[PDB]
UniProtKB/Swiss-Prot annotation, chain B:
It comes from the Eukaryota. Residues 1-78 form the Saposin B-type domain. Disulfide bonds join C4-C77, C7-C71, C35-C46. Glycans are attached at N21. This is Saposin-C. Transmembrane segments: none annotated.
Length: 77, 78
């Protein structure tokens, strides 16, 4: 109605907020430790994925956030 | 496909990684400026929402992230 509109607005702002340089820097610094915890037979393919798409994961995941589906879980849409 | 598994792994790790105290704090600090971007006709309903569900928004946002879907955007899955 209008609590859906306000909730949806807020989720959109949050999404925008956290798509920022502090978040990226933090993700990039962690990719090493992330691949290390994987079986030795998957190491190379992990590095290969990180060294191709690592820098673009955050934006892809944020871009897929559905403001109405978040607000649905909060019972506001 | 191992590249699909590896990609999906990475997405889950990133999702966990950003669900932390630095992120929540910056969200909590910014709710006032957010409600101000709204017409004065909606101020109260924005504050009612913030002061009921503001603390829950991050958690729900990341729970809803689909590792599968992100990797398909990356053409590493399906």
């Amino acid at each position: 109605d209008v609590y859906c509109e306000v909730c949806e607005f807020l989720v959109k702002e949050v999404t925008k907020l956290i798509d920022n340089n502090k978040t990226e820097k933090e993700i990039l610094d962690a990719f090493d430790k992330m691949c290390s915890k994987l079986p030795k037979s998957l190491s190379e393919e992990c590095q290969e994925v990180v060294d191709t798409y690592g820098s673009s994961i955050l934006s892809i995941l944020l871009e897929e956030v559905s403001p109405e589906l978040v607000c649905s879980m909060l019972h506001l849409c």
